[PDB]
Amino acid sequence: VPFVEDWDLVQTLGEGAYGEVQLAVNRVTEEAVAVKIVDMNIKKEICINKMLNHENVVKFYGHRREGNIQYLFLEYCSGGELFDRIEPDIGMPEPDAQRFFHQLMAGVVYLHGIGITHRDIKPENLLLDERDNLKISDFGLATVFRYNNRERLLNKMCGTLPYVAPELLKRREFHAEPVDVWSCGIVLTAMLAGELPWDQPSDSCQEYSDWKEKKTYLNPWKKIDSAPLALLHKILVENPSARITIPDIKKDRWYNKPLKKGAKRPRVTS
Numbered sequence: 001v002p003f004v005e006d007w008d009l010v011q012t013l014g015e016g017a018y019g020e021v022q023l024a025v026n027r028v029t030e031e032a033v034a035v036k037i038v039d040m041n042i043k044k045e046i047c048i049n050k051m052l053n054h055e056n057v058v059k060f061y062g063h064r065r066e067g068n069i070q071y072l073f074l075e076y077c078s079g080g081e082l083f084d085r086i087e088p089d090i091g092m093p094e095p096d097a098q099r100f101f102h103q104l105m106a107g108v109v110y111l112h113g114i115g116i117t118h119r120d121i122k123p124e125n126l127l128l129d130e131r132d133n134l135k136i137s138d139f140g141l142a143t144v145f146r147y148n149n150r151e152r153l154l155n156k157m158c159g160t161l162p163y164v165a166p167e168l169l170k171r172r173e174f175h176a177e178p179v180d181v182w183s184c185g186i187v188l189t190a191m192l193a194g195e196l197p198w199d200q201p202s203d204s205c206q207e208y209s210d211w212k213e214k215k216t217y218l219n220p221w222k223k224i225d226s227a228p229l230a231l232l233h234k235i236l237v238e239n240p241s242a243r244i245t246i247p248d249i250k251k252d253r254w255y256n257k258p259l260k261k262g263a264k265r266p267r268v269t270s
């Protein structure tokens with residue numbers, strides 16, 4: 001069919017360090033995709049993206065290189081970032097946060113199951129489709145932590161300070177999986193309180209010290225119900241060897257608490 005390979009770039013969705021993300025619309029089919037334009041890092045992001053296929057991971061359609069510029073054809077998520085669904089200093093309804101947290105765990109289980117660590121889980125990297133389905137986005141900082149069933153310990157300092165695990169700041173080497181678990185716990189905190197608990201998880205940070213001293217009568221913890229707060233007490237554990245694993249997060253009481261109705265389907269009476 002002539003013209004199927006032509007895409008019109010209709011609007012800028014976001015701009016940053018990389019370059020820009022544009023909304024692309026197919027000339028013939030009107031299919032909408034997100035095009036990530038990176039002017040030469042990208043080689044590892046494309047290589048990790050080629051391994052991915054899960055309903056809670058941003059789809060990779062392909063890549064095109066035009067000189068020194070790489071074009072990443074990625075899933076268009078019309079709901080934008082989870083970040084904008086979080087009301088400052090409030091959060092969001094607890095059943096919405098639980099559903100997003102379930103979907104976040106499904107995505108992370110998938111990535112860890114294929115030996116991939118995202119290393120930068122935050123609400124800006126969690127996108128929502130038209131049906132409010134969560135998708136893990138941007139694999140620019142991602143790496144392989146398990147290869148030929150052999151675990152590789154990490155030492156590289158990366159992520160975003162309010163979401164990083166304390167072992168990344170205190171230890172030379174650390175296991176990849178507990179780091180992503182920790183950042184998921186900070187995401188859950190943000191969804192339920194509309195605020196980040198600390199600037200970084202270090203002894204010099206007063207808010208982090210208060211949490212370790214179990215001062216849950218302070219913000220953000222006082223805004224969180226005791227059932228999701230008991231889960232946060234198991235995720236936000238300083239020792240990564242004692243920190244809860246994803247199989248045990250799936251056994252948590254709040255994680256399994258019936259709270260949300262399914263999407264309202266159209267109905268009529270008489």
Ligand SMILES: N#Cc1cnc(NC(=O)Nc2cc(Br)ccc2N2CCC[C@@H](O)C2)cn1
Nearest residue numbers: 013014021034074075076077078080124138
């Ligand atoms: N890497 C990456 C990436 C970034 N955006 C993707 N898809 C979107 O549809 N993104 C998007 C949609 C809307 Br509506 C508003 C903003 C964005 N983003 C722009 C670039 C930053 C990203 O966090 C979200 C897919 N993958």
